[PDB]
Amino acid sequence: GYDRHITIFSPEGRLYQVEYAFKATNQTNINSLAVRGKDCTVVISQKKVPDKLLDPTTVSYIFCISRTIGMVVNGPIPDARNAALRAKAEAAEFRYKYGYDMPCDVLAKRMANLSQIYTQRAYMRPLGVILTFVSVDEELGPSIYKTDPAGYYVGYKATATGPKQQEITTNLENHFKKSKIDHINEESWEKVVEFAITHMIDALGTEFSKNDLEVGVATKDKFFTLSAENIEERLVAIAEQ
Amino acid sequence: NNYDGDTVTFSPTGRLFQVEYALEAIKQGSVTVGLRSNTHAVLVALKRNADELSSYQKKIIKCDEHMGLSLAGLAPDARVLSNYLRQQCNYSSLVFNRKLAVERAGHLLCDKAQKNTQSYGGRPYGVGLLIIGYDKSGAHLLEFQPSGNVTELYGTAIGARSQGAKTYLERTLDTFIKIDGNPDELIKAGVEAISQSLRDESLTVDNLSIAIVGKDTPFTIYDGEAVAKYI
Amino acid sequence: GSRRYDSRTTIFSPEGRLYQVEYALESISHAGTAIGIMASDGIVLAAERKVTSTLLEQDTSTEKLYKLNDKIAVAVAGLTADAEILINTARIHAQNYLKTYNEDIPVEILVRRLSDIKQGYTQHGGLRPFGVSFIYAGYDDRYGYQLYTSNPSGNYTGWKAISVGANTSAAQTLLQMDYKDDMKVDDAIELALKTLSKTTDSSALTYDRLEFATIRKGANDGEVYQKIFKPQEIKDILVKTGIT
Amino acid sequence: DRGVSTFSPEGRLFQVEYSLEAIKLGSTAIGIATKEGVVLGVEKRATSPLLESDSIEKIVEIDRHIGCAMSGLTADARSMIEHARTAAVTHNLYYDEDINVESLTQSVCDLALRFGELMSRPFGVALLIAGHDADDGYQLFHAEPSGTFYRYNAKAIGSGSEGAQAELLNEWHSSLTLKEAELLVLKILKQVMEEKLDENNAQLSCITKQDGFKIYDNEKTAELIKELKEKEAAE
Amino acid sequence: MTDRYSFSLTTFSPSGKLGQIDYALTAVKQGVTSLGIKATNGVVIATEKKSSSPLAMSETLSKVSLLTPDIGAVYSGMGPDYRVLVDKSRKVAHTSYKRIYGEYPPTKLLVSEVAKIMQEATQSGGVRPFGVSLLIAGHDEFNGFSLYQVDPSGSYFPWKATAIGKGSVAAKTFLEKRWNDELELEDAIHIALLTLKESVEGEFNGDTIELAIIGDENPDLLGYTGIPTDKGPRFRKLTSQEINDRLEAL
Amino acid sequence: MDIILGIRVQDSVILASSKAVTRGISVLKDSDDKTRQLSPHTLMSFAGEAGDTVQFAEYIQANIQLYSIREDYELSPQAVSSFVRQELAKSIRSRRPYQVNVLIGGYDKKKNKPELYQIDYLGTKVELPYGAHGYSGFYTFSLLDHHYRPDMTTEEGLDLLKLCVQELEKRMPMDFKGVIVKIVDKDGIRQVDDF
Amino acid sequence: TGYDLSNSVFSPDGRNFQVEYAVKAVENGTTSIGIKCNDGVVFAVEKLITSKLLVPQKNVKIQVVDRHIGCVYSGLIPDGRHLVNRGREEAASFKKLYKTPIPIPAFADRLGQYVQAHTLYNSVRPFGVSTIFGGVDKNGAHLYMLEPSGSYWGYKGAATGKGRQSAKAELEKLVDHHPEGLSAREAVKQAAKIIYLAHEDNKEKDFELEISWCSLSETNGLHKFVKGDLLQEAIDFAQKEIN
Amino acid sequence: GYDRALSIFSPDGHIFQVEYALEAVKRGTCAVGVKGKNCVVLGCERRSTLKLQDTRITPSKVSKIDSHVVLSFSGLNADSRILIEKARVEAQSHRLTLEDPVTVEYLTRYVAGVQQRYTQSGGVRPFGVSTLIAGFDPRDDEPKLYQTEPSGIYSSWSAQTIGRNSKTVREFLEKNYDRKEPPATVEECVKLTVRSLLEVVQTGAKNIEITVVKPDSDIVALSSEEINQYVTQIEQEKQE
Amino acid sequence: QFNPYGDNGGTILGIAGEDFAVLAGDTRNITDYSINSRYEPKVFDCGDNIVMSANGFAADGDALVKRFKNSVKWYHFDHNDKKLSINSAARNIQHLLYGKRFFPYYVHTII
Ligand SMILES: [Cl-]
Ligand SMILES: [Mg+2]
């Protein structure tokens, strides 16, 4: 059964290598979450540092692709960094060629097209990663676009990724059923981050310290990650309510 | 077993079987000995023949006026690697007016052998080499293995029954290292060393091959009646 | 490395056969039958469309019969997509010859070159062969009316009447029975349709499941005309011979 | 399947070892080196009596001072000979001199291992390269598809090789004349050949400093065959 | 390194089958139902928007795509394969036609170019076939309106009406009963919505259905005025509101 | 090189080509044949740059002979001329173009007609009743305009050709050492030995 | 199955068995460590003395990249050398274009992307080394450890080889007992001790200690080998602790 | 480019792809070559399962390489065209540089060299074709007949056959052909060639092709009636 | 425009006896009207009892001598330490010089 070793069709029309790349996604055992505010897009991810000898500042699955675009990865770090470097190069080239900053959705499509090629061409394996791109696009506003090893991509009102993704997804679904809107009706990004963390706590059922989380925030004209103290300040605000 | 089809495949215990099979070709090869003092470095090689009508396969190759090696295993692979060394020694002379350090010679061979063990299609080199030389930091002796591993030594031996000569040199270490300013005595120690690897056969005039390099001695090879002195 | 997944498309069996060529021929044997019949005053090309659906647009369709130049046409049996690759090459080759010599390409030369391309895929490159058999119908001023066939092996031969695709065994026996050398085009038209009508896997042969073409000197004085039959024209010729 | 340049567990290249089996199936070729010259002889082995045996070219000239005999898949030798000839002539052009027999052999043997995944497989033919130069005198070399070459005083290759080599072991001495060597090749060829030896199914050649490389006529070889039979009956 | 897969991954089996093409067609069978109906004064192409998640914005994912101003495409099967085909199909319309003739290619020829690309994935080294079947609807001056199907093999057929994917067998039977040669465009849109309701299971509205037409020229969608010969694109994607209007009189 | 003429008459084509091969102030040869037989009924004369002329002529010859063997059939003079023109048309935009002008005289066996084609080094082809390359044309064209008739015999064509050679020998500055004349007709190509 | 026979093939788990098999080759190798300190880094390695015939101090395993980065590795030694040769090319092209010497995090990703690239195709083999490396740049000291998969992180202390668990346990104690920081000269002495303690997992053959270090104060931000008096001082410190 | 080594050695020292190419030759229609005192004759079988053929336009079994050399073959028909084309090009190339047409030995040596190259080149399979190459050297009246085969070996033959049931016709030729006295005339040579094919063919109708080559580019193919006369004559003498 | 050639002056002289040969050359090196060196040798021992000088443009002269010296070295490696005869050396040098026929070594060479 060599149809399970390379990216060719099985008798039932399936690509097993693509399916097994999806299972590599959860190898890190980390859950991510993305939501949109009015002026911003917030992405949060669990941060697990098991080894005491590790420098915790270097342990990250959130990346600054361009000034405006941010990306979180669900999957092994080597493939994550492979995808990040390429996305950075693509976003830089786009700006040089076309004279304006690459939109989040266009980058997502481009990275998705690259992923598609690996599912069709035999010598290249799929990357075992799910890429969640976030920005505040100058045309479309707050944006969340996600890519997977199949080469599929789509925009999101909000999204979650990881082992316990389904619990987080339904938690968010039930909120948007209630609120009756496509986003978090909130002025400051600080409170959108607080919303994101609060709903992750409810869905996963775990409490978080400052070093258990990793937060990325996209605003107009810049994307930035939060420090441990920025998150701690945020955790204190949730606790006092 | 299932992981020896090519060099690009690791075994479940983390072994490269094609590299190990290439290593096996050296063990089948005829014995050759290397040893040095502080002034000179000596190669001694037991040559092998197909039969009594044939010549004895030449084991020792000159790389430069100050460097050369002896081989054990696939001779054509030794020719490729020796030719590469000749070019690298020569590049150093023409471009930098500088005799290639014996240590760099080893580093270059290591890196050349390594590339063959990580790529599809190619194969590892099937030969082991003993490089001797005299450079700006005195006399040297290297042992090259086609896994890529190069090792600097006072003395050593490779080939079939090389363990006999290697044990002898390990005992004689303190004696032969201080044979300074005396070529004939350092060779004698090498000829006595290779004798520990002999079975049924003995050292004859067209069987033995000796080479030497040193302070005021260019790399020169001795064969035929020139080695009759040492039998 | 990649050796593991190589099918080795261009090798010999122990018996001295080319696996992929033999299997490509097996594929072609399930394709809709195509018949070529060469008369003294023209050539007929007849082909059966593969199990037609009632909602298929019949008039603006081309599956079996293709035009290579004004003097040469082909009937296809096998993978249509493969055939179109080869047809465009053949069309270009014809124009190269015309550009070079200021003369229309002789039929055999075009056939040989197209067959040489197929041959290449069986001997080198490690690719699968083209799953296509052609019936070439054409005219030139050297040999006049000519029928050829080529197959995935790249081997070509000349014919007076020939079939490719499905039920060639039965079709060839029927052609061999009723064919004769002094035959006219209108008689060949009738033979072609009668043969298909008997060898067809369908219940009854109808206009919507057929492609038809003639290459006559039926134009005005010493010049050849290609006629790719329209649906209504096939309907009329089918009634005229008394099949429907 | 498996790689072309793969090592066996014993430390040998599969393809090189398999090509050696092909050479054993080949027709016998014998070479003997003396101080008066080097003699090369081969078994022609015509597959059918209708085949014109004089068209069987298994002994070949490389230069005036170097000859060559072959055994195995003889079609593979054509590109080896072509290379040898070009190497010999090219060296003469660059250096205004004859090329050493060893240097020629070494150049041919450099092709041997230029196979893999360069050509697709090793050569299926062994060569006996005989010649003379001013430095090392009369020389005989056995060039294999492994890229290895040995110098020999005498050597047999092909189907009757191991039997013929054992015979050459006893018969060869350092004071053989050219005439003695000629008869010795004929003697040993007749022993290992299937069909009965004559001038049409066996060919002799030699290389001498004075006259260079010469393939013998069927008339000349026939007299040596007749001279050989008489000498064996004479005791 | 380097692409060492220079050999075909699709080969003939002893029975004469091309395995990878058959398996690609199996992947198309699993895919969501899409359809196309040809009218006298237009063509309609339609499909269900299968949402991967309710949090996902299905507007951002376009199953129906404009190739040229007068040609549109829809598919059934693997979305990513479709997306790259649309990119290549749009580019080939320019490189191999518009940059040569100064006008857009006719439907049949663009279809032919797409078919060529899909055929090459069936024969070229180190690639699998595309896992999609396309339905390409279009208009051009000399051929009028047309509708084509393109399969993984690279084969293409012209249709009066057809369906592909999940419930294509039932959908084709439905279309046979309803289709006639006198259908007006609005009647074809009506039948398209009826046919599609059979295959769709969950919600059936303008947000879960994607539908586009090839009809009259749209000067309002052109973007400029002043050139009389340029009259606007015949391809138009029906809005979520426009679909719901027709679902009331269903 | 220098003088090459061609005259198409009723039933044949006649090619006249000068015999001189000059280099510097020395006539190296006075018996040079500036022509090649491309096929049994097709002859090509040539003139131009040294080396290029023969190299081109022989290259064309080889290609036409190759075609003849492959198809077991003789290419028409029109077809050969079109092939030659295209080769020159490629050449003119090459790194180093063939500086060769040619006349192609042939007898079409299917049409039963003689044909004369004039092609220059640029790839400029023309079918003509009479043709010339180089400075020769400046004398012969006007002469032939006057004396030529389309229904002439081969013998009349040779007398017409003698008239051209006489005029050239009288008014041309250089000694071209006479001409080699060849006739192309239904029976093939033959050389006139006494001219 | 057969998922482990080819590199870059995902198993049904989502694993690349060929990379995990390369890790086994790393685990088989000698012990090597890295210790981050106040204003720099310290590297140390176990050199098994196979025979008396090995020349002491003349089979150097620690390698320098540029003039400010040190690299050490465990596993297949030639594979490590190949990686360093690439690192040197990467560092040279960075300095060529951007003038400044390559930063350590920048350098870490250059190796990371290169090693990761060798898990993408079946025509190459993964690297049979875990590489501990680091140095001093404009932002201060950095220590890294890179694995066959291409995975790397920043470390306070790093260890790999046959005695990695023994070394890790000893490293974890230093991190706990010295929260404010460890000095460069201290780290050299500790490195010696940890190699000696980690030698208990490879105690058939006796060994040779090799240490190097980068430090903003002690070595002026350049990579240097610890030799002579400073080396013997570190050896004596280690000898005293085992007894 | 496709690189795979298809032709490789097996444990017993055989190159199976070359040997399987010989099986394709064994499947092919029979071809025979017989050289007389002043001529060579090439006889060829044509299988009679194919009726409704057009013999005017169907590729002939014997091909002219130059005006003085011919080539017949047994095995894959498509493969033979490639060898014939290359040989024809080399023939014209030889005339161009040497100013002399090829010798039959040289042309054979070239064709054989091409066949050999395909046995140790990557990405290609050997030619499933053996050839009989016959003709006369320029300004020479000595007949030449050569054979080639997929492996690349070539040799000269007084008479030889290849293809299916070739071992039967070779058996016939081995006892019927005298080396001391070859067929003195054209008629004798053609008759012996036709006789040898009649051991294998079936009927002597449109199954046998005969081509006669004589010195100085004198090649002609016999028609049906001309060949049928030999068939009629041989059968009447047989009934004895 | 950049001129890749220069003239370094000087002169050389070779004479052959019965059982010996001399190759002489002055030691002056110049450019234009300036002296670069009063002692810059341009007659070299190349091994195998061959002496050589390439006078004219010193950069080309040194390059040639360097290449020939290297040619002697590789002649030993490739041909079992055989002595390069003066006639063989001469032919080898022809190929070195002619190899740059279209961008010549601007030197008059004597061995
Ligand atoms: Cl893209
Ligand atoms: Mg003109």
Side-chain angles (χ1 to χ4, degrees), chain A residues 90 106 109-114 117, chain E residues 83-84 87:
Chain A
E90 292 289 348
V106 178
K109 186 191 175 174
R110 173 55 181 167
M111 295 303 294
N113 284 145
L114 263 29
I117 289 165
Chain E
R83 194 176 62 252
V84 299
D87 291 335

Side-chain angles (χ1 to χ4, degrees), chain A residues 36-221:
Chain A
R36 308 184 302 171
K38 282 161 63 72
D39 287 356
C40 65
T41 309
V42 174
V43 66
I44 62 164
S45 180
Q46 297 187 254
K47 181 172 177 168
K48 293 181 183 177
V49 188
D51 195 345
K52 216 197 298 176
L53 300 175
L54 282 165
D55 181 7
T57 53
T58 65
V59 179
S60 179
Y61 287 88
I62 294 184
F63 299 85
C64 301
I65 304 304
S66 69
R67 192 166 293 161
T68 56
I69 293 173
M71 184 194 71
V72 66
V73 188
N74 281 70
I77 194 69
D79 286 7
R81 282 162 179 164
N82 180 102
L85 176 59
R86 184 51 173 279
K88 288 168 179 180
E90 292 289 348
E93 186 188 305
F94 187 97
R95 175 58 184 77
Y96 173 73
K97 274 184 162 150
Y98 305 111
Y100 73 98
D101 293 339
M102 194 172 202
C104 180
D105 61 293
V106 178
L107 175 60
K109 186 191 175 174
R110 173 55 181 167
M111 295 303 294
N113 284 145
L114 263 29
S115 290
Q116 186 285 147
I117 289 165
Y118 315 139
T119 69
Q120 186 160 207
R121 219 100 81 188
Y123 85 109
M124 289 254 49
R125 73 167 171 85
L127 300 172
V129 293
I130 287 175
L131 313 173
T132 314
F133 296 94
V134 292
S135 85
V136 180
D137 192 63
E138 65 182 325
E139 288 193 43
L140 298 176
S143 292
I144 304 166
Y145 286 80
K146 195 161 72 176
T147 298
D148 56 31
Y152 172 89
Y153 96 104
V154 71
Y156 287 90
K157 297 164 185 171
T159 191
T161 319
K164 287 196 272 281
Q165 152 261 116
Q166 188 55 51
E167 284 91 319
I168 300 163
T169 308
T170 37
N171 182 282
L172 292 161
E173 285 174 15
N174 296 139
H175 175 264
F176 292 120
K177 267 203 187 79
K178 212 177 202 173
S179 72
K180 210 106 290 171
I181 48 167
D182 286 6
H183 59 99
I184 311 310
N185 188 242
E186 203 70 56
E187 300 279 33
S188 69
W189 61 264
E190 284 90 333
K191 296 215 93 78
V192 178
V193 175
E194 288 169 19
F195 175 95
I197 295 166
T198 293
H199 280 248
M200 173 152 281
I201 286 162
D202 298 350
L204 297 180
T206 44
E207 212 79 60
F208 298 114
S209 68
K210 65 184 177 178
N211 308 299
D212 296 337
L213 279 175
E214 190 177 18
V215 184
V217 186
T219 57
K220 198 203 172 187
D221 296 322

Side-chain angles (χ1 to χ4, degrees), chain F residues 44-64:
Chain F
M44 187 170 78
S45 64
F46 47 85
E49 173 62 23
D52 285 358
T53 46
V54 175
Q55 283 284 171
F56 180 73
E58 291 180 2
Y59 164 73
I60 295 300
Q61 190 181 46
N63 273 107
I64 301 303

Side-chain angles (χ1 to χ4, degrees), chain F residues 118 120 124 133:
Chain F
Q118 185 179 139
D120 76 356
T124 313
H133 275 295

